[PDB]
Motif scaffolding. Structure first.
Motif, short mmCIF file in Angstrom:
data_model
loop_
_atom_site.label_atom_id
_atom_site.label_comp_id
_atom_site.label_asym_id
_atom_site.label_seq_id
_atom_site.Cartn_x
_atom_site.Cartn_y
_atom_site.Cartn_z
N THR A 91 -21.33 51.07 -32.26
CA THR A 91 -20.07 51.79 -32.14
C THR A 91 -20.10 52.83 -31.02
OG1 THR A 91 -20.74 53.40 -33.82
CG2 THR A 91 -19.58 51.43 -34.56
N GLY A 92 -21.29 53.23 -30.57
CA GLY A 92 -21.42 54.14 -29.46
C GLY A 92 -22.45 53.67 -28.46
N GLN B 50 -17.60 53.24 -25.75
CA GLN B 50 -16.69 54.38 -25.79
C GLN B 50 -16.00 54.58 -24.46
OE1 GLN B 50 -18.93 57.80 -26.98
NE2 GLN B 50 -20.45 57.64 -25.35
N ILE B 51 -16.67 54.23 -23.36
CA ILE B 51 -16.06 54.18 -22.03
C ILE B 51 -14.87 53.22 -22.03
CG2 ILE B 51 -16.52 53.45 -19.65
CD1 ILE B 51 -19.26 54.57 -19.89
N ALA B 52 -15.00 52.10 -22.74
CA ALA B 52 -13.88 51.18 -22.89
C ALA B 52 -12.77 51.76 -23.76
CB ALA B 52 -14.38 49.87 -23.50
N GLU C 82 -14.46 43.21 -27.53
CA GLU C 82 -14.53 42.45 -26.28
C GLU C 82 -15.41 43.11 -25.23
OE1 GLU C 82 -10.64 41.68 -24.85
OE2 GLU C 82 -10.14 40.23 -26.43
N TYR C 83 -15.93 44.31 -25.49
CA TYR C 83 -16.89 44.93 -24.59
C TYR C 83 -18.19 45.18 -25.33
CZ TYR C 83 -12.95 45.57 -21.51
OH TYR C 83 -11.86 45.35 -20.71
N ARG C 84 -18.68 44.18 -26.05
CA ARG C 84 -19.99 44.24 -26.70
C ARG C 84 -20.94 43.34 -25.92
NH1 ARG C 84 -19.36 44.04 -33.30
NH2 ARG C 84 -18.29 46.03 -33.57
N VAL C 85 -21.58 43.90 -24.89
CA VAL C 85 -22.74 43.25 -24.32
C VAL C 85 -23.96 43.48 -25.21
CG1 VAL C 85 -23.46 45.17 -22.83
CG2 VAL C 85 -23.89 42.79 -22.09
N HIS C 86 -23.91 44.49 -26.08
CA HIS C 86 -24.94 44.73 -27.08
C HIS C 86 -24.29 44.65 -28.45
CE1 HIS C 86 -28.31 46.70 -29.23
NE2 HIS C 86 -29.03 46.27 -28.21
#
Ligand SMILES: [Mg+2]
Ligand SMILES: [Mg+2]
Ligand SMILES: [Mg+2]
Ligand SMILES: [Mg+2]
Ligand SMILES: [Mg+2]
Ligand SMILES: [Mg+2]
Ligand SMILES: [Mg+2]
Ligand SMILES: [Mg+2]
Lengths: 87, 275
Positions: free
Chosen positions: A21-22, A27-29, A13-17
């Motif tokens: 995986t990094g 990873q901040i998420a 759900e936090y894939r703007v790209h």
RNA sequence: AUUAGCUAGUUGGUAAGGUAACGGCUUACCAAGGCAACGAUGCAUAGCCGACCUGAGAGGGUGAUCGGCCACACUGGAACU
RNA sequence: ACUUGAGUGCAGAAGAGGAAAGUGGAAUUCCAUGUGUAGCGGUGAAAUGCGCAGAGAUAUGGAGGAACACCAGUGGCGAAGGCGACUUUCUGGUCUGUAACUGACGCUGAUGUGCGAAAGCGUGGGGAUCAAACAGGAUUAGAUACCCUGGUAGUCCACGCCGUAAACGAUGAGUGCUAAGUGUUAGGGGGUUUCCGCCCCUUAGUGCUGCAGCUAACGCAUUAAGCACUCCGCCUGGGGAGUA
RNA sequence: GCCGUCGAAGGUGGGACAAAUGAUUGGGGUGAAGUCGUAACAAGGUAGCCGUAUCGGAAGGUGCGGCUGGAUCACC
RNA sequence: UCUACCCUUGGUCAGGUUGAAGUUCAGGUAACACUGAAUGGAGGACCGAACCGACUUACGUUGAAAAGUGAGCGGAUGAAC
RNA sequence: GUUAAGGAACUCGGCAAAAUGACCCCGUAACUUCGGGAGAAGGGGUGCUCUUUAGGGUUAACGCCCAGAAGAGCCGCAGUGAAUAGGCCCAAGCGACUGUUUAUCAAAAACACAGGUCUCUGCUAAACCGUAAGGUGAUGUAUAGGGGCUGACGCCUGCCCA
RNA sequence: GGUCCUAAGGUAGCGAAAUUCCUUGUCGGGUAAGUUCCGACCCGCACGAAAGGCGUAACGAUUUGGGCACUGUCUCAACGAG
RNA sequence: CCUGAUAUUGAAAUUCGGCACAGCUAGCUGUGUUGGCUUUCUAACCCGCACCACUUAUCGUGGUGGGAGACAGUGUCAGGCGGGCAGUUU
């Protein structure tokens, strides 16, 4: 802790790209999903302190990734702050 | 715990209260209250027995169930109220018959509980069941003494007992004062420790709220001229001049034991007190 | 720095007056700023440069006669041509 | 735009790293009775003391509280102080192999801020052993001394503080670098993987012996006190003095 | 000549910093050691030292933790 | 029926003043989370009448009164009257 | 009720009187339990008339009450012009505080006090009143009841059991 | 250090004090002059640790000494009113 | 107040001592009589112990329980503490 059958959901759900995986995003998420779960151990247990050195350690790691992210993208830096509530 | 105070006045300099965070539904139940007229030591002759009593604030007695009848009926716990007549708090249980009653409240209690002799009787906090049906090492309170009489021993705030073992017909109880003692095997016992444990740190802080609780001042002995206290006057202040400090009626008060050779207490008290 | 806060007309607009001119330059209503750990503020010591002294040099210590600039006139203000 | 540094993903192990809750065994002390009975102790020597009113010895009994034999060793772990009975729920970091991943995202840190061995203090619990203070007997010309039976604050837990030590590897962190031999612990590479057989290698901690070099000398010497780079902390005769 | 704004000196009052001084008083160095003991350096004859308590005329002694900068046989 | 404590049922205290806990918003927090501004109305709290007391002093002492009047004086939301 | 010059020289002693007194402003030390000290102290201004302007509520609004600023001017020896209303400061002693005491020669440094301890009480509790029945303690039960001493808070409480 | 004796035979802290007879102790400060007052010394006739010992902000119709302010209390009295 | 001796007050026991000398080798054995210590059972007595009736009275008496039990309470006698209180001397 978070398991590695539920850690993967935090990325998606936090894939703007796409297929990363990094990132300065994902990873901040993952770190916030531990900080919200280490700090609820640390509202029940308080006499331990080796966890509270790992607690201080992980946030200042994110403060370096976030300050990198301030100096690349104007509207992706501001999006990640607004999306989770974290400053 | 205890909410402190800030020294805005010399009265409130070190006064310390007791925070009422474990009190729900502050209004009472208007069918279990009975009136309570005071007396300061005024027996049926009007004279003065026991000294230092009287006045303060009006109270109203709240009818407590110490018997714990109504066997095998699940009792909910509704609201935890405040009781001025005693040091513990109070509870308002509702049996499933709609018979609302009061229970002295143990340590943690909001759930719902059972009184039954030996059905299964569900050993938890708040459940009362006779001492033959209690396993050893089990902290109990509000024990009966005579069978069917009513719960007498260890009813304070933060008090407790302890079942040690089981003798030929009695059981063996360690009391809060440290005095092992035999109790008959069909006396009941609430399981648990009675709540409101922060009670003895309430620094009263002021001679006025130690005075509207029903206390009057207590004049020391060495300032009475010797009509009425055996520590009589003398010029200046004076050491007591007796071999033994005496109470105001002649009996030595510092050291001498007072109980007498009594029925059904010598064959039961194994260990004495520890102080 | 064994001194950390500091000024209040202080910081700014506006007004008319004010001197060779700019001017908080002195006054009036509004406006919430000045400075600062990159040393702001306060104490004790001091005229300052060109040069003199010593030194392999880099530097250290000095400020007199001799020139340039500065302030002062037993003490503290204020003027007039 | 680049992928060696730094970070995550996936594949895997080794742990006395913490924090709450239960649970178990062996020894110490005190209470109950017997059989039993003049000695138990302690010591250079002795006693002071407990004992003859039945002590120690001797058995079952039950009351408590505290440490955690044997494994246990050079081993392990955490940044340090430190952490060794077991089971359970919750909880940090490090490492091995690398196909993946955005693409310099670094190192150091003046103030700040957070953990700190024991002793000590505050408010409550609980108190077996050891035991400053303290009384006792002798050793001493004299003896809290050293020696002996006794002994309270303290030791253990919960909460809030104080923050120092020969807090040491007497060696601040970070990167690359330069002769080699011999162990040990958790992992990976070449075998029919012979199972604690074996040699063949590569990587990370861990100890020993030893060139060039450096050092006043001792001694370090791939885990440098060698050759260099970055940033931080400190010293400038001995007392006076870590005092005013 | 009079009125007003601004205005040195003076008088009033509570503070702030250094300096001079003061009955006694507490440690410190200096000497010359007369007075009282031996606490270190040999295992200094109770192994020492660093923190931290408590007691004593005098160095100092004991308790609980860490260190070897601890002899013997280096405490197998 | 005075006075001393005491039980049951009532009544009374002009006014003015400071601003405790908390709660909310904003500032920083996500570390160990504490500063300001508002709001709230705490107390044997401060100034002062009714009301309750009786500290100094003068007068009175075959008193106006077998215990008082004149000028001042203390408590006054409580252990009050 | 007033008083020349002086102002405690009076006296057991500043005893009585005299001064200070309201509201609005500037400004305020040592010391501390961080609340306090504090009305600390020491200071200034106030009257009437006239011109302009910014402030609530009531109301459709003229109208009405509540107020605060500068400026200009007038008069007296004196502008809370009469009555009503704190004197203050430095240093010690005892008691922590507010309280209460000898109706009628003593209001305190005495009594109480919140807190510290010590001892007694297992419930028909000990304790006390009553020859007894009965009651108080209590429709309370060792975090609760009766008694002895000390008297918040801070640092502490030393040896002797013949 | 010797030695008698007692059941051991005054520790920290305060000290001419609400406690000290002689005594108006003594040196310092205060005043033109201080038997009272304040700071110290200690030889405590006879302080001393819950008949508590030593300190202390705040509070007192408490007790003791010194300043400014104000005044018929005073040197010294005179006049007026009910 | 404390402590004995007896009265109210009954049965079952088990040991231990004084007599008695019963056996006839300082101490054994075992009968006739005396005084204890204990241990258990229930019939008096006791309960400010539970429902039940007199009664729509937490006083009382009556009633099946459950507790404790020949101790306690009580009567007479005897000893010991007793300025809590009294009469008087100095
Ligand atoms: Mg510790
Ligand atoms: Mg160490
Ligand atoms: Mg009156
Ligand atoms: Mg009165
Ligand atoms: Mg004043
Ligand atoms: Mg003052
Ligand atoms: Mg009775
Ligand atoms: Mg008499």
């Amino acid at each position: 802790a978070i398991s590695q059958e539920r850690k993967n959901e935090i990325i998606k759900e936090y894939r703007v790209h796409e297929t990363d995986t990094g990132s300065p995003e994902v990873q901040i998420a993952v770190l916030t999903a531990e900080i919200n779960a280490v700090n609820e151990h640390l509202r029940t247990h308080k006499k331990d302190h080796h966890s509270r050195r790992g607690l201080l350690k992980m946030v200042g790691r994110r403060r370096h990734l976030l300050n990198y992210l301030r100096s690349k993208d104007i509207q992706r830096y501001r999006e990640l702050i607004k999306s989770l509530g974290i400053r | 715990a205890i909410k402190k105070y800030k020294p805005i006045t010399n009265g409130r300099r070190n006064m310390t209260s007791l925070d009422f965070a474990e009190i729900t539904k502050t209004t009472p139940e208007k069918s279990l209250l009975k009136p309570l007229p005071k007396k300061a030591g005024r027996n049926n002759q009007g004279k003065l027995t026991v000294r230092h009593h009287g006045g303060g604030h009006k109270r109203q007695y709240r009818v407590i169930d110490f018997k714990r009848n109504k066997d095998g009926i699940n009792a909910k716990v509704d609201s935890i109220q405040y009781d001025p007549n005693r040091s513990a708090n109070i509870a308002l249980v509702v049996y499933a018959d709609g018979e609302k009653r009061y229970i002295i409240a143990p340590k943690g209690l909001e759930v719902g509980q059972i009184v039954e002799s030996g059905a299964e009787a569900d050993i938890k906090v708040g459940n009362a069941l006779p001492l033959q049906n209690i396993p050893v090492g089990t902290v109990v309170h509000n024990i009966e003494l005579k069978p069917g009489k009513g719960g007498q021993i260890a009813r304070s705030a933060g008090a407790s007992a302890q079942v040690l073992g089981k003798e030929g017909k009695y059981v063996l109880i360690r009391l809060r004062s440290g005095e092992v003692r035999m109790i008959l095997s069909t006396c009941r016992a609430t399981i648990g420790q009675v709540g409101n444990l922060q009670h003895e740190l309430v620094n009263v802080g002021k001679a006025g709220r130690s005075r509207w609780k029903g206390i009057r001042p207590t004049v020391r002995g060495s300032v009475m001229n010797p009509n009425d206290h055996p520590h009589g006057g003398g010029e200046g202040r004076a050491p007591i001049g007796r071999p033994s400090p005496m109470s105001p009626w002649g009996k030595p008060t510092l050291g001498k034991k007072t109980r007498r050779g009594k029925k059904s207490s010598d064959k039961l008290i194994v260990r004495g007190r520890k102080k």
